Write a protein that binds this ligand. Sequence first.
Ligand code: MN
Ligand code: MN
Lengths: 372, 379
Amino acid sequence: GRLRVVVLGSTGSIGTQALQVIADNPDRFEVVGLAAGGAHLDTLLRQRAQTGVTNIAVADEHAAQRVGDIPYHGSDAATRLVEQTEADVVLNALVGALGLRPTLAALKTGARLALANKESLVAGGSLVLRAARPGQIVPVDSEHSALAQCLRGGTPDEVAKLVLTASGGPFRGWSAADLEHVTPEQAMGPMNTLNSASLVNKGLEVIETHLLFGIPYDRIDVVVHPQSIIHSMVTFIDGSTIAQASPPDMKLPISLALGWPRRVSGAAAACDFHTASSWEFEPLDTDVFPAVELARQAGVAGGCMTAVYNAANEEAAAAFLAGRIGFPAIVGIIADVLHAADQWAVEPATVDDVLDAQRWARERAQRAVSGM
Amino acid sequence: GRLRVVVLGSTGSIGTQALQVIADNPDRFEVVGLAAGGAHLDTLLRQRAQTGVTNIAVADEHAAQRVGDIPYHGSDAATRLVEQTEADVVLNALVGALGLRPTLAALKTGARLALANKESLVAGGSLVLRAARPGQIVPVDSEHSALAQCLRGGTPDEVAKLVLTASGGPFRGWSAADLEHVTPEQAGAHPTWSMGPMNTLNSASLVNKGLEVIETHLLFGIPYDRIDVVVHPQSIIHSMVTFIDGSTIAQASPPDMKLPISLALGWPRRVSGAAAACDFHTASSWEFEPLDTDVFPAVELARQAGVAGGCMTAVYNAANEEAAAAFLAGRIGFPAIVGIIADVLHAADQWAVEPATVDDVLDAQRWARERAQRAVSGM
Ligand SMILES: [Mn+2]
Ligand SMILES: [Mn+2]
């Protein structure tokens, strides 16, 4: 009785690592579907050959044509694959807010959603939550996987605080003036790396924490931990903190999300306490790095505001990577877009509501770029 | 609901802190019995006056002579109190040998045993385990309390390693040559108001950690080859569990025994506001380093004793007590403490037999003490 797994974004870092965990664990997992964008066809063809899975979605029509025998092709390909494939688990490792429809489709099938695409939850907000049963979304994000594990340390009424760790990025300790000169070269993928550096990733993760676990924003702490060995912690009402620790390796949270609640033997190397190490903690410099506070503000506003936060980032980040704006302008644009986003506090009733909010935010972010 | 608590060893560090937790949480706990040895009779009488608990026991019959209205007095006073008192939880914070019989009596009543007394497991071993039912014993000490919490991170089948943290003591990082020079004062022989010199000394020699490793094996049923020790000077991480997938779950808090005491009393329910939580507003670091087992072999020796089983861990502990006594008195050097334990253990194979009675345990200790005395004197 193997779990049938659909892997969305199969050719990316998380996707390939997931396929490796599945290949190492044939008694527990079986691949039944693959989805890819179409930029890494070499990898996709190998994946088809090795897994024997022809049930494949390709987003780019030209790429799907170039390949051949692809049953699902076009922008809605991944969504239709999910809708029409019998599965126990959908791993959503697509990139960006475009993971939204496949996330909704997955939840509506009743399968466990192993979520790597944090953007679909951040953007979807209550719309995504209303489609899910309790515990149906299982995080692949390292911090949230850690939180889920640490929450086993007590009952829900015993939780005082959730403590999200953050690497601090390559610019930890830098001044506001220092960040002016940051180049795209200095800052997994281009977006994952950049969002880490700008602290917008951590803002997205704070929102993700609130939505997954239902804890109020004022009880979600962020601490900088440069070693990235402690992946997050939960503080309980008696003063006890339970923390999860492991050498960085996404195969650990991937494996746990795929097989929840059961741990997968040998998924990753454990901390080695026969060698010296230091786990350091320091407060986030919120003045220099206000992305987390902006996320909290968007989160408290709720409705479609978190979709706005993410959409504004996607556009500003693209502008930065293209050499059009400076590094500090990323969070500057997000703030400008949010201040103008009055009407988006309304709760999304349909996917179209979220899409409307994102459309508006993308336009407004472009407006903000044009004024620079 | 309100748990009825018997506090054995009410005048010690653990007992008094427990009473503070109980005083601060009257909706959760009520004291229904108090027992003490007698050396601190005045404290016990004040506790009777303060709590209104008249159900009290004094072990020292000679000390009991000073009061006309103690219901339980004499050698087995604490045991008799436990046997005759309706309670939900028995906190056993008695010191040494006087803790073993009360542990067995507590287990027989069907009450939860919040266990601080080390003798009960280290010496009692299979006697205590055979009398206990799953989950009946809840550990009071910080490392074991941490382990119990971290074990919530998976099923028993998912456990790979139990990892105990150790402070490293005052001689953390010292060479073998350095340790030759250690004086009792350096090893922490100061006449502290609450504790004797054995606690600090056992920390310094790593014998305390050895004892904790033995207790870990007995409490949690993990083999010795899967119980690790790491030195962590800050004592913020109190212990950890590594699971089969590579995940480690750790318990962290500023040092404060009220946390593990509160949890042992209220298990499985946490006690709101028991202790302060880790505060990350100021930069800090948690450091880990391996123990040099060549310089500090006490833990390895404990594993040897534990694997041998039977009364061998009783022998380990009793040899330590005698050797540690010789060191504090200036009869041997610091490095000779573990040397003597080793020498006694290697001659002790007759004690690998499982104890049938308390007297079997006491006989093993007697033999070990005498053997250690011979080693010290050279006779
Ligand atoms: Mn993350
Ligand atoms: Mn301890």
